[PDB]
């Protein structure tokens, strides 16, 4: 028996009981996350915990077949994700403290509060009361006052725990044989391709560097144009020629500039291209939002929902008196279980919301035939690029006019177009360099670039000298202010957002091109494209077989993440921002500050 | 020379064959314990089958679907098993696969098709019937036709696992992971008188005559005459040293018929 054999073996088992316990501990969240209950959640966590305690024995086991020995890729993929986690390396103390400091940092976002100067019994908590003020108010002293006091009562108290959080994480990457905490986060994109050389974690950094370079010209362009109009917006606050204070950016960290359209709308006659009272007159439900979705999938050859998908879902939130989790959310529960859990309402932002889960349970019902270690997407970010690509097929103004929810009589002059590039900016480009940030801050952190007396000064000069924004008060070492987002207090990765932005604009133009579309490529939509449907299923079936470098170069031709098919995305919205840009100053200065 | 006739023989049989207490039996056996029923000395109406769009696979391979009720066979073995909706195409000659190597398997001249139709409404329950099992592995592939009822253990690394494993059939779950049961007959070439046949009736012999005949499904056109040849009691046809069929026992009334040629010599049409 070679040890490929034995290989075999051991993974089928895996396969039969993970299929078991999985579908198992799945439908214990749908029934929890469907009928709040403290009964339901004492469920939910016994199937969770038999589920991890299987998968960590089965872990520990996997590690007896050398992968070098191992000749078929598919059973040394396997082999590898199983090797690569399931054994925590730090002891029992260790382990403990660092489920207490999680908990901990968890615990203090969510109770987090903001108490007014003048009156310290009126407060206000993160959702909504504190978001809302960033999101909606233009007042620069009350956001001052929300941005400062998130950051002194959040960041301080993470403060001590986050230090001890990366000794922690660093300690723990370093068992699995990884270099720090942000080396053993890039494995994600690490390939072993047969052919010669493939991808590695450096290999990595240095892609998303020079993709920052690269994006830097629209991005400098953008922050400009921002600039100015932030200028019109709040005067004697703003530098022509410095950064943007963090807290006028919309949001508590300015992760999106969404929430600026409003003021840099850039024709404010023109409207939008909002369909909820078309919906709503025509008499749609959540049934023909998901019946109009499928319709739209099965134009391109994708297979149809299945009988399952529409007698399990909720589509809707229940009225019967049971407590729901609102947050959209396609499930793949295993077994051939494809469910969706979201408050479907009659708008535009839930029929594009429904295209992008329905997008995820079509590459869910695809790696199906795949083995369960590799039912995932290629990488962190292909998945979330899928049903990105799938919300920008569908959102074009044709498919609406072809639906009737647009009318025929709409005319898609310059103006709408450019009006409908700078929001698509204002949510993608300017969080590229925010995500390209936070992401190298968070490397040089664990790696120890950065040591623990310079956290905040250097997170002050990177913000300033990559994103262009500067703090609005001076900030000692007492300060966490990084700590002070949801990811990095809960400890989840963010450069999956940047590919997953290069990955979608990449699948976006090779489709378009597929499907013989000739003009601009925003205005582009795969429906009715069976070649286009034909290779995107292709893409979407092999899930993790095969290096998603390959994959990336079976449908899109090229094997190397590439920001030009983003660039040419954007080339309208460039060129206007370029003539925009001749009287104003493109680029800022890292030396001044509000405070000073 | 055009038949002017049909000649068409059974033997004399009037018991309907017992399909229905195997279709609709209350209870399937597992793939690894699959149930064999034999069918013999019976009249096989197929009616009750074909005609029913209950069935989603119907595959006959070496036979005709149309023609079964036509063709009479030695014995008919009914086989019975539940297996998963993505596994039924396991169930064909050639193929290979977890049901074809530890629990179950077709010849390659396999004669007779499967029957498989959904049952999760009878096999499925909402928090999943566990009593249905299959064996991930055995030692070696198994004979065709062979039967593994042992329950033994056999080894995954260091741990010792049961070779048989519980199939998990939820209601929740999809077509390709729903619970399926399937029956397939298996058919026996003629080497002994025919004991399950169609439900048509005898019609009367025609000699010396161009007929066209079929005598226990073998179908065919010649004159039919009094032969002299003597056949065993196990022998229904006989065949010349061009190992052509020239001789057929009457299944009614047990006599031996020669086969001739409507025409001898070359005829040209003016
Ligand atoms: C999957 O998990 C379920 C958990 O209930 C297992 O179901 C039980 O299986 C044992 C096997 O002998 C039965 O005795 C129990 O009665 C079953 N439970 C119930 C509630 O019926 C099942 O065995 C597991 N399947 C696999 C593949 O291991």
């Given at each position: 028996?070679?040890?490929?054999?034995?290989?075999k073996?051991?993974?089928?088992?895996?396969?039969?009981?993970?299929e078991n316990?999985?579908?198992?501990?799945?439908?214990?969240?749908?029934?929890?996350?469907?009928?709040?209950s403290?009964?339901?959640v004492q469920?939910?966590?016994?199937?969770?915990?038999?589920?991890?305690a299987?998968?960590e024995?089965?872990?520990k086991?996997?590690?007896?077949?050398?992968?070098?020995?191992?000749?078929?890729?598919?059973?040394?993929?396997?082999?590898?994700?199983?090797?690569?986690?399931?054994?925590?390396?730090?002891?029992?103390?260790?382990?403990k403290?660092?489920?207490?400091?999680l908990?901990?940092?968890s615990?203090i976002?969510?109770?987090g509060?903001?108490?007014?100067p003048?009156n310290?019994?009126?407060?206000?908590?993160?959702?909504?009361?504190?978001?809302?003020?960033?999101?909606?108010?233009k007042?620069?002293?009350?956001?001052?006052?929300?941005?400062?006091?998130?950051?002194?009562e959040?960041?301080?108290?993470?403060?001590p725990?986050?230090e001890?959080?990366?000794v922690?994480?660093?300690?723990?990457?370093?068992?699995?044989?990884?270099?720090?905490?942000?080396?053993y986060?890039?494995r994600?994109?690490?390939?072993?391709?047969?052919?010669?050389?493939?991808?590695?974690?450096?290999?990595?950094m240095?892609?998303?560097?020079?993709?920052?370079?690269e994006?830097?010209?629209?991005?400098?362009?953008?922050?400009?144009?921002?600039?100015?109009?932030?200028?019109?917006?709040?005067?004697?606050h703003?530098?022509?020629?410095?950064?943007?204070?963090?807290?006028?950016?919309?949001?508590?960290?300015?992760?999106?500039?969404?929430?600026?359209?409003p003021?840099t709308?850039?024709?404010?006659?023109?409207?939008?291209?909002?369909?909820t009272d078309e919906?709503?007159?025509?008499?749609?439900?959540?049934?023909?939002i998901?019946?109009?979705?499928?319709?739209?999938?099965?134009?391109?050859g994708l297979?149809?929902?299945?009988?399952?998908?529409?007698?399990?879902?909720?589509?809707?939130?229940?009225?019967?008196?049971?407590?729901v989790?609102?947050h959209?959310?396609?499930?793949?529960l295993?077994?051939?279980?494809?469910?969706?859990?979201?408050?479907?309402?009659?708008?535009?932002?839930?029929?594009?919301?429904?295209?992008?889960?329905?997008?995820?349970?079509?590459?869910?019902?695809?790696?199906?035939?795949?083995?369960?270690?590799?039912?995932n997407g290629?990488?962190?970010g292909?998945?979330?690029a899928?049903?990105?690509?799938?919300?920008?097929?569908?959102?074009?103004?044709?498919?609406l006019?072809?639906?009737?929810?647009?009318?025929?009589?709409?005319?898609?002059d310059?103006?709408?177009?450019?009006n409908?590039?700078?929001?698509?900016?204002?949510?993608?480009?300017?969080?590229?360099?925010?995500?390209?940030?936070?992401?190298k801050w968070?490397?040089?952190?664990?790696?120890?670039?950065?040591?623990?007396?310079?956290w905040?000064?250097?997170?002050?000069?990177?913000?300033?000298?990559?994103?262009?924004v500067?703090?609005?008060?001076?900030?000692?070492?007492?300060?966490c202010?990084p700590?002070?987002?949801?990811?990095?207090?809960?400890?989840?990765?963010?450069?999956?957002?940047?590919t997953?932005?290069?990955?979608?604009?990449?699948?976006?133009?090779?489709?378009?091109?597929?499907?013989?579309?000739?003009?601009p490529?925003?205005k582009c939509?795969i429906?009715?494209?069976?070649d286009?449907?034909?290779?995107?299923?292709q893409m979407?079936?092999?899930?993790?077989?095969?290096?998603?470098?390959?994959?990336?170069?079976?449908?899109?031709?090229?094997?190397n993440?590439?920001?030009?098919?983003?660039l040419?995305?954007?080339?309208?919205?460039?060129?206007?921002?370029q003539?925009?840009?001749?009287?104003?100053?493109?680029?800022?200065?890292?030396?001044?500050?509000?405070?000073? | 020379?055009?038949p002017?006739?049909?000649?068409?023989?059974?033997?004399?049989?009037?018991?309907?064959c017992?399909?229905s207490?195997?279709?609709?039996?209350?209870?399937?056996?597992?793939?690894?314990?699959?149930?064999?029923?034999?069918?013999?000395?019976?009249?096989?109406?197929?009616?009750?089958l074909?005609?029913?769009?209950?069935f989603?696979?119907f595959?006959?391979?070496?036979?005709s679907?149309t023609?079964?009720?036509?063709?009479?066979?030695?014995?008919?073995?009914?086989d019975?098993?539940?297996?998963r909706?993505?596994?039924?195409r396991?169930?064909?000659p050639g193929?290979?696969?977890?049901?074809?190597?530890?629990?179950?398997?077709?010849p390659?001249?396999?004669?007779?098709?499967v029957?498989?139709?959904?049952?999760?409404n009878?096999?499925?329950?909402?928090?999943?019937?566990?009593?249905?099992?299959?064996?991930?592995?055995?030692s070696?592939?198994?004979?065709?036709?062979?039967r593994?009822?042992?329950?033994?253990?056999?080894?995954?690394?260091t741990?010792?696992?049961?070779?048989?494993?519980?199939?998990?059939?939820?209601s929740?779950?999809?077509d390709?992971?729903?619970?399926?049961r399937?029956?397939?007959?298996?058919?026996?070439?003629?080497?002994?008188?025919?004991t399950?046949?169609?439900?048509?009736?005898?019609?009367?012999?025609?000699?010396?005559?161009?007929?066209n005949?079929?005598?226990?499904?073998?179908?065919?056109?010649?004159?039919?005459?009094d032969?002299?040849?003597?056949?065993?009691?196990?022998?229904?046809?006989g065949?010349?040293?061009?190992?052509?069929?020239?001789?057929?026992?009457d299944?009614?009334?047990?006599?031996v018929?020669?086969?001739?040629?409507?025409?001898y010599?070359?005829?040209?049409?003016?």
């Open positions: 028996s070679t040890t490929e054999d034995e290989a073996k051991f993974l089928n088992d895996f396969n039969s009981e993970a316990l999985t579908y198992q501990s799945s439908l214990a969240s749908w029934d929890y996350n469907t009928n709040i403290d009964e339901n469920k939910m966590d016994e199937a969770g915990a038999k589920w991890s299987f998968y024995e089965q872990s086991i996997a590690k007896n077949y050398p992968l070098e020995e191992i000749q078929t890729d598919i059973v040394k993929r396997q082999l590898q994700i199983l090797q690569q986690s399931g054994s925590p390396v730090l002891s029992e103390d260790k382990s403290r660092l489920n207490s400091i908990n901990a940092m615990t976002y969510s109770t509060k903001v108490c007014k003048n310290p019994q009126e407060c206000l908590l993160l959702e909504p009361g504190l978001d809302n003020i960033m999101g909606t108010s007042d620069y002293h009350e956001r001052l006052w929300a941005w400062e006091g998130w950051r002194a959040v960041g301080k108290q993470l403060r725990l986050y001890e959080y990366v922690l994480k660093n300690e723990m990457a370093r068992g699995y044989h990884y270099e720090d905490y942000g080396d986060w890039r994600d994109y690490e390939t072993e391709e047969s052919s010669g050389p493939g991808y590695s974690r450096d290999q990595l240095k892609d998303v560097d020079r993709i920052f370079t994006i830097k010209p629209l991005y400098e362009h953008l922050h400009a144009y921002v600039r100015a109009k932030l200028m019109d917006t709040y005067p004697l703003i530098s022509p020629t410095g950064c943007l204070p963090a807290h006028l950016l919309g949001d508590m960290w300015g992760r999106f500039w969404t929430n600026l359209y003021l709308v850039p024709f404010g006659q023109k409207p939008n291209i909002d369909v919906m709503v007159k025509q008499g749609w439900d959540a049934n023909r998901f019946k109009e979705a499928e319709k739209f999938f099965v134009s391109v297979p149809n929902m299945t009988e399952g998908f529409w007698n399990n879902s909720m589509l809707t939130e229940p009225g019967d008196g049971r407590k989790v609102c959209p959310t396609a499930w793949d295993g077994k051939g279980d494809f469910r969706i859990k979201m408050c479907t309402k009659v708008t535009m932002e839930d029929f594009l919301t429904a295209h992008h889960e329905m997008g995820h349970i079509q590459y869910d019902m695809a790696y199906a035939s795949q083995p369960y270690l590799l039912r290629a990488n962190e292909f998945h979330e899928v049903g990105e690509v799938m919300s920008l097929s569908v959102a074009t103004p044709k498919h006019k072809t639906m009737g929810l647009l009318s025929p009589d709409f005319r898609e310059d103006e709408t177009e450019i409908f590039l700078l929001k698509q900016a204002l949510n993608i480009v300017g969080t590229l360099p925010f995500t390209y940030m936070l992401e968070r490397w040089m952190v664990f790696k120890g670039e950065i040591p623990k007396e310079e905040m000064k250097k997170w002050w000069e990177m913000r300033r000298e990559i994103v262009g500067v703090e609005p008060v001076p900030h000692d070492e007492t300060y202010d700590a002070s987002l949801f990811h990095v207090a809960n400890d989840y990765s963010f450069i999956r957002y940047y997953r932005t290069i990955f979608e604009f990449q699948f976006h133009e090779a489709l378009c091109r597929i499907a013989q579309h000739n003009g490529l925003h939509d429906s009715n494209s069976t286009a449907g034909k290779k995107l299923h979407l079936s092999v899930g993790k077989s095969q290096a998603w470098t390959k994959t990336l170069e079976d449908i899109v031709g090229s094997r993440m590439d920001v030009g098919p983003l040419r995305y954007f080339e309208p919205l460039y060129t206007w921002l003539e925009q840009n001749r009287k104003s100053y493109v680029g800022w200065n890292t030396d001044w500050s509000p405070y000073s | 020379v055009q002017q006739d049909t000649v068409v023989r059974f033997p004399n049989i009037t018991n309907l017992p399909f207490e195997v279709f609709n039996a209350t209870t399937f056996a597992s793939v690894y314990a699959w149930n064999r029923k034999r069918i013999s000395n019976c009249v096989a109406d197929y009616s009750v074909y005609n029913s769009t209950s989603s696979t595959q006959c391979y070496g036979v679907s023609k079964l009720n036509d063709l009479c066979f030695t014995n008919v073995y009914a019975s098993f539940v297996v909706g993505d596994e039924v396991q169930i064909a193929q290979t696969g977890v049901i074809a190597d530890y629990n179950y398997k077709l390659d001249d396999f004669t007779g098709c029957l498989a139709w959904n049952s999760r009878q096999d499925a329950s909402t928090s999943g019937n566990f009593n249905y099992y299959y064996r991930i592995w055995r070696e592939k198994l004979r065709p036709f062979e593994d009822i042992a329950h033994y253990d056999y080894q995954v690394g741990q010792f696992k049961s070779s048989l494993k519980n199939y998990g059939f939820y929740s779950a999809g390709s992971h729903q619970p399926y399937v029956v397939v007959l298996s058919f026996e070439l003629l080497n002994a008188p025919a399950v046949c169609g439900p048509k009736q005898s019609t009367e012999l025609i000699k010396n005559k161009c007929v005949f079929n005598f226990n499904g073998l179908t065919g056109t010649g004159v039919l005459t032969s002299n040849k003597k056949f065993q009691s196990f022998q229904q046809f065949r010349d040293v061009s190992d052509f069929t020239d001789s057929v026992k299944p009614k009334t047990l006599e018929l020669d086969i001739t040629p409507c025409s010599g070359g005829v040209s049409v003016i």
